[PDB]
């Protein structure tokens, strides 16, 4: 328990040389290059049999008794050879089996040795204890004990059991024990030595379990000496003799090229405290594996400058992973509060902030440290690191800044692309901007050019972002080509191919069998160490943790909704908001292309959906008396320009509809309405420029027009200036791609824009020009008015009349005067706009044509020309229903369908129900449609055929009549209340509370 405390006392009492050596061993350990020469000393801790035991056994067998005297290093080897020769090899093998064949257990040192991620472990021991020691920790190793094992090298990590081992068998022939084997090693094992030399060459040997004068230590010493001067780092020696090392021996083996450490020099120990000594040194090194070298708080600025200065490269980094720079020592929370997670030393980070508060303390530093703190504080401010969590006062988080790519700017983008690229960062920005503009091929080639130039200048950050961007844009090119060749032909009728097939072959060739997931792994150890934050970008499964954060926080927020619980401090929605703006600022400031990918859009979309969902609930949240006691008049959720552009960019129009339906957006007031209007004016103008000119980059068009559609659709709430309204409408009607927005979507978007801001006479002129163009599109008989939302230019004219009580479009009137009988299609079109033309034009068209069939009758009544139903009109209705009846009895043997006739028949049923047409024949046609029976004769009609669409789709006057009739009023109220009780719906509740009860 307190062993760690006493050993930490030993640390920082250690001579600087020892601590620096320990840190070097740790750093090489992390690099997977550190190698260990573990000797019998470590195995002695296991009580493994010692060679002198077999030596004495051999002496007894030879001369009938032991030596009763110390064996020299030559004797330790010589007596075994005398036994091997005088007697033979058989009893040699027998004695090896008798002694070394033991299942000794490993000890703490055996696993500590493995805690350093040994690249290799070259052991001269003949034991199999060291093999198990490797599994103990988990490191894999390949055992080598002969020439043949040199082939069997499955891994990059070697347990080079040099001098042989009894794994072959307990035989002297299978090991190096007798003197001759030691002398003839260079000839007996060419290949083990072959490996041995190379591994010793570059890897950081660290000696342990050995005596300084050990024969194997001396062999390795001479072998490292054979290397070129200054071409080998001094390996280390974890010496653990109970006696303190003689200074002269220390000087000798430090000169020889070994970085030696004595446990006895670090601690005090007994004579048989071998395990204690090994543990002391190894555990000092292990505690160094954790950063505990933070000496004093006044030194803080140097430490933070070591950690943060290389980090200036990014234009911003997320505070989520800024903790990873300090290895989870200080968690930088989303709001900026720096939560202290761990700090072995005092003033690890907190002293930096106390300096930030106390300016006088900040004055105590050298101007070097002063400006160091200055730069680091500027970096933290860029990060939004508000204050240390412990002393953090009242906070006021704000919208994170984003780059111009986040803004709806494309003219600036092209200007800068035209402008000369000053340096590598300029070219990286140019590549991202070209990618944004749809010039994906130019961006890709520039990315490759900067790949070359960036490894040339050694900008690891810029190169690595360029690599990941190049892969991401290549994926975009490939998927775009697939989309084109697969579906664009069905879309346009003739698939384009902006990307040349040779270019696609080239880009596919340059990158094959290459996963960006391994891109960070393939980087230099320097870059990997100083840029561990950018590892998150390596994995192709982007947003590898932001999605989980969103999932958990969405759950929590829904739970808060359902529980109806108050909150104090920042809540779940606050952290969702903070993470969202952190991710946006990071990705757009760094100019990564990964934003355009679907997954990032989905993450942004879900976050904003949850944010607005909780925004709606807090508005209608009820407050208890104690709820009011804790807090009252809480801050409302806002919709700034930045949040608008999020909604526009990341949501689809169906998603915006879904969220508007679920949540009343109009209530939550919008912010930066002027900036919103300017950005919408920008979208409109860009569309005008792109569509008026024939030039329409197809990839760019697909990339951005979704943005414009969403912004136009979601612009229903924001106010626009008069000139802005002119621009936005002129974009919406004429220059908008007709392929995506049919006439109906066009009309309803214009109607929403009307709903917030009125259309002045200028906009009236714009829409009149659009209508006269539709007339000029109607000169050809082949032209057809066709929409998905059942909305036509007649509805546009209805809007103009709704705005202008009196409006005579002289263009339409002149057209009608110019129209002749042969232009009957144009006569029909101008008829739909009959209210909008002059009196003379009305008379002209009335002369040209009048009602003759049901379709023309519905046309006329929609225009309102006929103010009363003639007997001919009702008789025409009777004839049409006679046709429908014969068709239905004919269709009775078939399946019966009604999708357009049903509209006319429902209107006729309505008119019977409204006692407008007394005709009793429409009663005779009862039985065909459920709604027809419901209207013509509700009492006979069984009220089980009532549809939910009927329950919610309605008319005000029709609802009044329904309430007025009691027979259908009972049934309809019953089913409607039943449905709202089943599923609470706003329309159902309104229909309940307003017309019947």
């Amino acid at each position: 328990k307190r062993y760690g405390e006493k050993l930490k006392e030993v640390f920082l009492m250690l001579d600087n040389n020892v601590v620096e050596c320990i840190k070097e061993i740790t750093e090489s350990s992390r690099n997977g290059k550190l190698v260990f020469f573990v000797g019998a000393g470590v195995s002695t801790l296991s009580d493994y049999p010692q060679w002198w035991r077999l030596v004495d056994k051999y002496h007894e067998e030879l001369y009938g008794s032991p030596k009763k005297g110390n064996y020299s290093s030559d004797e330790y080897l010589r007596i075994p050879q005398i036994f091997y020769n005088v007697k033979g090899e058989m009893a040699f093998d027998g004695i090896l089996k008798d002694f070394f064949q033991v299942d000794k257990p490993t000890n703490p040192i055996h696993d500590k040795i493995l805690a350093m991620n040994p690249a290799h472990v070259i052991t001269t021991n003949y034991d199999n204890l060291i093999d198990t020691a490797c599994w103990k920790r988990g490191k894999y190793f390949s055992v080598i004990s002969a020439e043949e094992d040199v082939a069997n090298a499955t891994s990059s990590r070697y347990l080079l059991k040099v001098h042989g081992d009894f794994r072959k068998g307990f035989k002297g022939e299978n090991v190096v024990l007798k003197e001759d084997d030691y002398l003839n090693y260079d000839q007996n094992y060419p290949l083990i030595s072959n490996l041995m030399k190379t591994i010793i060459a570059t890897h950081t040997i660290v000696f342990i379990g050995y005596g300084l004068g050990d024969y194997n230590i001396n062999m390795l010493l001479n072998w490292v000496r054979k290397l070129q001067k200054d071409s080998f780092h001094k390996p280390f020696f974890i010496r653990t003799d109970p006696s303190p090392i003689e200074n002269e021996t220390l000087i000798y083996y430090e000169n020889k090229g070994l970085r030696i450490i004595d446990a006895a020099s670090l601690i005090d120990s007994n004579e048989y405290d071998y395990l204690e000594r090994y543990s002391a040194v190894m555990d000092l090194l292990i505690e160094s594996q954790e950063n505990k070298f933070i000496t004093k708080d006044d030194e803080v600025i140097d430490y933070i400058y070591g950690k943060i200065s290389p980090l200036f490269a990014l234009q911003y980094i997320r505070k989520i992973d800024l903790k990873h720079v300090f290895e989870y020592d200080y968690h930088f929370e989303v709001n900026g509060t720096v939560v202290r997670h761990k700090n072995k030393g005092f003033g690890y980070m907190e002293r930096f902030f106390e300096l930030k508060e106390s300016c006088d303390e900040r004055s105590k530093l050298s101007k070097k440290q002063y400006e160091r703190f200055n730069a680091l504080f500027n970096f933290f401010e860029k990060n939004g690191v508000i204050c240390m969590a412990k002393d953090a006062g009242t906070l006021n988080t704000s919208i994170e800044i984003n780059s111009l790519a986040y803004h709806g700017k494309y003219d600036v983008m092209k200007k800068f692309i035209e402008e000369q690229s000053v340096s590598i960062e300029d070219d990286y920005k140019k590549a991202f901007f070209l990618a944004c503009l749809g010039r994906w091929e130019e961006s890709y080639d520039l990315y490759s050019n900067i790949i070359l130039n960036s490894i040339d200048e050694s900008n690891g950050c810029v190169y690595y972002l360029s690599q990941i961007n190049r892969y991401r844009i290549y994926q975009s090119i490939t998927q775009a080509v697939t989309q084109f060749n697969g579906l664009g032909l069905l879309t346009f009728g003739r698939h384009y191919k902006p990307f040349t097939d040779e270019f696609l072959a080239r880009i596919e060739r340059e990158m094959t069998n290459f996963n960006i997931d391994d891109l960070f792994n393939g980087m230099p150890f320097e870059f990997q160490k100083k840029y561990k934050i950018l590892e998150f970008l390596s994995d192709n499964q982007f947003l590898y943790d932001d999605t989980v954060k969103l999932f958990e926080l969405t759950n929590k927020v829904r739970s808060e909704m359902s529980e109806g619980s108050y909150s104090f401090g920042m809540s779940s929605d606050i952290v969702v908001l903070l993470r969202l703006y952190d991710n946006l600022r990071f990705l757009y400031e760094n100019c990564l292309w990964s934003v355009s990918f679907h997954e990032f859009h989905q993450y942004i979309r879900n976050s904003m959906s949850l944010l607005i969902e909780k925004a709606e609930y807090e508005r209608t949240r009820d407050i208890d008396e104690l709820g009011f006691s804790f807090f009252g008049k809480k801050s409302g959720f806002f919709m700034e320009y930045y949040d608008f552009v999020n909604i526009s960019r990341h949501f689809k129009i169906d998603d915006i509809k879904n969220l508007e339906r679920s949540c009343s957006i109009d209530k939550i007031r919008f912010g930066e309405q002027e900036k919103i209007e300017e950005y919408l004016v920008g979208i409109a103008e860009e569309i005008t420029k792109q569509f008026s000119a024939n030039g329409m980059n197809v990839v760019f068009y697909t990339q951005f027009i979704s943005e414009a559609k969403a912004a136009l659709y979601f612009a229903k709430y924001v106010k626009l200036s008069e000139e802005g309204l002119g621009k936005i409408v002129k974009a919406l009607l004429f220059y908008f791609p007709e392929r995506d927005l049919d006439i109906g979507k066009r009309y309803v978007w214009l109607e929403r824009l009307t709903k917030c801001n009125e259309l002045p006479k200028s906009i009236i002129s714009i829409i009149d020009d659009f209508l006269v163009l539709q007339a000029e599109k109607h000169i050809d008989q082949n032209y057809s008015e066709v929409s998905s939302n059942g909305l036509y230019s007649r509805d546009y004219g209805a809007l103009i009349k709704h705005f202008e009580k009196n409006f005579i479009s002289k263009r339409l009137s002149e057209i009608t005067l110019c129209l002749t009988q042969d232009k009957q299609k144009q006569i029909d079109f101008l008829f739909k706009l009959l209210p909008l033309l002059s009196t003379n034009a009305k008379s002209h068209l009335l002369s040209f044509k009048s009602v003759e069939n049901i379709n023309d009758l519905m046309n006329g009544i929609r225009i309102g020309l006929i103010d009363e139903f003639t007997p001919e009109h009702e008789e025409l209705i009777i004839e049409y229903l006679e046709t429908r009846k014969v068709n239905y009895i004919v269709e009775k043997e078939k399946g019966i369908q009604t999708f357009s006739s049903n509209d006319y028949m429902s209107t006729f049923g309505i008119w019977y129900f409204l006692e407008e047409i007394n005709n009793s024949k429409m009663e005779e046609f009862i039985g065909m449609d459920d709604q027809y029976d419901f209207f013509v004769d509700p009492e006979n009609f069984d009220y089980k055929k009532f549809i939910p669409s009927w329950l919610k789709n309605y008319n005000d006057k029709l609802l009044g009549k329904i309430a007025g009739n009691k027979h259908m009023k009972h049934h309809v109220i019953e089913v409607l209340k039943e449905r709202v009780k089943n599923s609470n719906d706003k329309r159902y509740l309104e229909i309940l509370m307003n017309y019947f009860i």
Binding site: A480, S706, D742, E751, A798, N855, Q897, F899
Partner: protein
């Protein structure tokens, strides 16, 4: 156990009798909400009443395979031939099949520009039942004994 009437959709060119691509239907969305003159603002007189309702049909499919001839050769209109079996609660399996067709449709999928990372093979394609003045809706349902 699960739906046992897998839908075969045939999407053909309308001008000429050529098949474009066949797929498997995934979902159909129907909306009947009044958006003409938004909610209120339509034509209204004392004796005159007009049903101003407007509706839109959306359909999704999956596993789109295009006819080789249509790729080879490559105002234009297309049809749909949604093909499923009519199943009643009384008869969950019926020899008779239900035939749904949309002779007037427009291909406009939001999957265009979907650039998801890693594996992807769900080219869902959206369609909108395009309407005309003469006929409020073109969809038709016929059951073949």
């Amino acid at each position: 156990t699960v739906i046992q009437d897998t839908a075969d959709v045939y999407f053909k060119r309308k001008s000429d009798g050529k098949l474009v691509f066949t797929a498997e239907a995934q979902t159909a969305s129907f909306s009947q909400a009044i958006s003409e003159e938004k909610l209120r603002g339509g034509i209204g007189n004392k004796p005159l009443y007009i049903l101003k309702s407007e509706k839109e049909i959306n359909l999704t499919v999956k596993n789109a395979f295009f006819d080789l001839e249509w790729l080879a050769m490559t105002s234009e209109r297309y049809e749909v031939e949604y093909r499923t079996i009519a199943y009643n609660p009384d008869t969950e399996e019926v020899y008779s099949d239900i035939y749904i067709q949309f002779p007037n449709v427009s291909p406009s999928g939001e999957f265009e520009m979907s650039l998801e990372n890693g594996n992807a093979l769900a080219p869902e394609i959206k369609f909108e039942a395009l309407a005309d003045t003469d006929t409020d809706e073109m969809a038709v349902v016929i059951e073949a004994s």
